[PDB]
Amino acid sequence: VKCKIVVVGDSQCGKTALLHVFAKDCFPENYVPTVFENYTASFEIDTQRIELSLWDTSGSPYYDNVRPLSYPDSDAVLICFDISRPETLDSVLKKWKGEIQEFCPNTKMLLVGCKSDLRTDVSTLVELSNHRQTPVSYDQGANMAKQIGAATYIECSALQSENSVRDIFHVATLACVNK
Ligand SMILES: Nc1nc2c(ncn2[C@@H]2O[C@H](COP(=O)(O)OP(=O)(O)OP(=O)(O)O)[C@@H](O)[C@H]2O)c(=O)[nH]1
Ligand SMILES: [Mg+2]
Secondary structure, three states: OOOOOEHHHHOOOOOHHHHHHHHHOOOOOOOOOEEEEEEEEEEEEEOOOOEEEEEOOOHHHHHHOOOOHHHHOEEEEHHHHOOOHHHHHHHHHHHHHHHHHHOOOOOOOEEEOOOOOHHHHHHHHHHHHHOOOOOOOOOHHHHHHHHHHEEEEEOOOOOOOOHHHHHHHHHHHHHHHHH
16 A cells, blocks of 8 residues: 655756656656655556655755655665666665665565666667776676665666666565565
């Protein structure tokens, strides 16, 4: 019936677009750095009505001081990274895991790779090669999920696949109700 899900990850990794496509099927036209947002409503998940409380947060270190205020009583935490920026994956390991482990010790964390569509975007690929990098590979992400002890690994593209975004929240809900 009710599940609280909080989304965290580095700035610009895709959190807000992920949440807006799910909650309104509306991809955000312009980018605005997030501080906090909450959207609480009844969603039809397959059949069953489930009341989700969705929390958006800041990826910026400058809000580290208040970010944890959103964590109490979370049923699932979606730790997100940007598939087009491998440094955001390192953050899941060096910062996000520790922060969730410290404030939501008993919560299920899902590792969510965002912007999967950028894996085939030439501009992205050229800029990454110029720094001797490639996008995070599927296997790289999955390996990071085992590394941090995440309940699962999943990927999406809020920009190009509404279904991929639906799948994120369906699995996050599953994580919630399985307890
Ligand atoms: N190609 C692509 N770009 C995306 C996708 N999702 C988001 N973006 C873009 O990446 C930028 C950041 O997306 P947001 O969802 O606002 O980032 P955030 O993680 O919410 O950022 P903070 O609020 O600063 O933590 C925006 O310009 C988006 O339009 C995606 O699935 N594909
Ligand atoms: Mg945001």
